[PDB]
Paper text:
The crystal structure of the PE-[name] fusion protein showed that most of the protein was visible, except for three small disordered regions comprising the first seven N-terminal residues (in the PE domain), the linker region (residues 136 to 143), and the C-terminal His tag. PE-[name] also crystallized in space group C2 and had two molecules in the asymmetric unit with a noncrystallographic symmetry dimer interface (area, ∼450 Å2) via the PE domain of the fusion protein C terminus. Interestingly, crystal packing analysis revealed a crystallographic 2-fold PE domain dimer, very similar to the one observed in the isolated PE crystal form, with a comparable dimerization interface area (∼870 Å2). It is unclear whether this crystallographic dimer represents the biological dimer, but it probably represents a favored interface in the crystallization process. The PE and [name] entities of the PE-[name] crystal structure have tertiary structures that closely match the isolated PE crystal structure and [name] homology model, respectively. Only the N-terminal hydrophobic α-helix tail was missing in our tethered [name], but this tail provides both an anchor for the globular head and a hydrophobic surface for the assembly of pilin subunits to form a pilus and as such seems less accessible to antibodies than the globular head and, thus, less immunologically relevant. We observed a more substantial crystallographic symmetry dimer interface (∼870 Å2) in PE-[name] via the PE domain and one of ∼890 Å2 for the isolated PE (excluding the C-terminal His tag). Interestingly, our PE dimers were generated at pH 4 to 4.5, close to the side chain pKa of the key interacting residues Asp52 and Glu54, while the published structure was obtained at pH 6.0.
In the present study, a vaccine antigen based on the fusion of two known NTHi adhesive proteins, protein E (PE) and a pilin subunit ([name]), was developed. [name] is another ubiquitous NTHi antigen described to be a conserved protein among [name] isolates. It is the major subunit of type IV pili (Tfp), which are hair-like filaments involved in adherence through ICAM-1 (25).
Numbering used by the authors: 8 to 135, 145 to 250
Amino acid sequence: NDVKLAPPTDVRSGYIRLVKNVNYYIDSESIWVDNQEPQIVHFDAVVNLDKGLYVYPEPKRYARSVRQYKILNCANYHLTQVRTDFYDEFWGQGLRAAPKKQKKHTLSLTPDTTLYNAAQIICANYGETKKAAVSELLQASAPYKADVELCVYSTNETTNCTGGKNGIAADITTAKGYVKSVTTSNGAITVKGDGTLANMEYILQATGNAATGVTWTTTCKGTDASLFPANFCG
């Protein structure tokens, strides 16, 4: 038949308008992310209709809303529509029409696209640190500093306080996390960052001995040395 609907004027809790169409909502409560793929955001869009769609076995029953299951890749702004469901109540609830085949399709959300700003917002909230990374870079030298001090008290010199000698652990030459490498030579521990910290490096140098006192200097290098914590760099 032909039924005219009056879509709800007030926004239901958990739904939000982010596009020109006031009857098209993002269902905030539906949003989920798998932490193993942290830039891939799963969500439903919901449209409240202004005319019923007769898509049920019973010829008098009609849909009042549509729920579209979407996947947004925040790394490349690709948006995939996965499934479309028709519901007999507003807000994508109630009895669901029989499933139809979705021509699964993906598109790139460039700045002219209707959903571009909605995607920016979804990504800001769900699609994904630096201080914790820098802390790990600092912690990398800790075991080596301890090893070098032990060496200096035992041997009475900084010469030969080198990785793989005098109880000093071997140099780390395999990148792991934010640490590219840790090397120790003659009382100098050189730490280089990796990835986001690739432009950060520091050198901890031991000088002296028991009688003079064992002193440490910290020298920082790299274009991003400004990211080191207050008072760290000498």
